[PDB]
């Protein structure tokens, strides 16, 4: 579309969600009113509107359409602000939408670049390397009223490595396509893969620039080092340090239960103040080798996740915990900055 267009887009009715650009939502449309829309959509723009509930949301574009009922799969693309809402008789809802802004900015030193220096800006393809990176990319900081290290705090490529390095303390694993190269894309991945609650998510989606959004996500990863029960708010479950990745998968992948319920499940070494419900089992144990025991807040008995315990004696770790993103609330043991 256009970064600040006013477009109209149909709303998947009962669907309710925060959709981060670049997330896929699987949908099964059976009510007849709905399947009609999907039909029109897929013949036309193939994009509907996922609302935040609230005057915000994301557009979702369809990349998979199978009629059995209509079964679809959409990717999130653009964030918007609701302007109007036609709740037509059919039961579907049309929406006047303002596309929120993805400001893309040049390098900080682009304007202050000394012509003579322009033929050194291409660099030839580790602490020392990034020390030189900053000494060379921001050399022309001497022409301004600010120092080099300040400009690094707004330099997309630095911000991103800063984020990678932390994310690696959670998953000694990949470092290549593992994460995107476009600040915008990378910014959006981080948001959907941090252990944050929907409000934090909504903040990042309301941020206008990929640079401001990376700075934010960094602030989240540096200040909200404690994860509490979202429901009673008075129970610290686990701390940033205890995050790890059981397999390549990652530290909070999405797993499916025998009933299609999905669970972004952050694996942590130790959790606290949790009561265990029942006897361990192994059915559909997402982590083959350990058994699961349901876990809940000792104060409000809200579901937090499971406790995985090793069947064998070889395996390490012997115990760990899986906590589902929707139960958790990040907390600062002070605001988040742009």
């Amino acid at each position: 579309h256009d970064d600040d267009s006013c477009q109209v887009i149909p709303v998947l009715p009962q669907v309710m969600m925060i959709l981060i650009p670049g997330q896929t939502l699987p949908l099964q449309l059976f009510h007849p009113q709905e399947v009609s829309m999907v039909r029109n959509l897929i013949q036309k723009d193939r994009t509907f509107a996922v609302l935040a509930y609230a005057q915000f949301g994301t557009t979702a574009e369809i990349y998979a359409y199978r009629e059995e009922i209509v079964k679809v799969k959409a990717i999130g693309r653009q964030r918007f602000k609701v302007l109007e809402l036609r709740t037509q008789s059919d039961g579907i809802q049309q929406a006047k939408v303002q596309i929120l802004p993805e400001c893309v900015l040049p390098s900080t030193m682009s304007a202050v670049q000394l012509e003579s220096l322009n033929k050194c800006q291409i660099f030839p393809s580790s602490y020392k390397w990034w020390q030189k990176y900053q000494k060379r990319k921001f050399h022309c900081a001497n022409l301004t009223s600010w120092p080099r290290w300040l400009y690094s705090l707004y330099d997309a490529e630095t911000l991103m490595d800063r984020i990678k390095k932390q994310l690696r303390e959670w998953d000694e694993n990949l470092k290549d396509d593992s994460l995107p190269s476009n600040p915008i894309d990378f910014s959006y991945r981080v948001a959907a893969c941090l252990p944050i609650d929907d409000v934090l998510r909504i903040q990042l989606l309301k941020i206008g620039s990929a640079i401001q959004r990376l700075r934010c996500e960094l602030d989240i990863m540096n200040k909200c080092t404690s994860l509490c029960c979202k429901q009673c708010q008075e129970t610290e479950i686990t701390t940033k340090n205890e995050i790890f990745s059981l397999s390549l998968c990652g530290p909070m992948a999405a797993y499916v239960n025998p009933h299609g319920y999905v669970h972004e499940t952050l694996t942590v070494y130790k959790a606290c103040n949790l009561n265990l419900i029942g006897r361990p089992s192994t059915e559909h144990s997402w982590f083959p080798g350990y058994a699961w025991t349901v876990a809940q807040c000792k104060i409000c008995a809200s579901h937090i996740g499971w406790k995985f315990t090793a069947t064998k004696k070889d395996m390490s770790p012997q115990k760990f915990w899986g906590l589902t993103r929707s139960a958790l609330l990040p907390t600062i043991p002070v605001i988040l900055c742009l």
């Binding site: 319920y261 559909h284 699961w292 409000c300 579901h303």
Partner: peptide, 26 residues
Amino acid sequence: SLTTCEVCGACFETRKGLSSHARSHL
């Protein structure tokens, strides 16, 4: 069967136990 949670997979002795659990999800 009647006493397992569809969402987290918990199993109660009783089909009331299961409803008081269903709250804690909503």
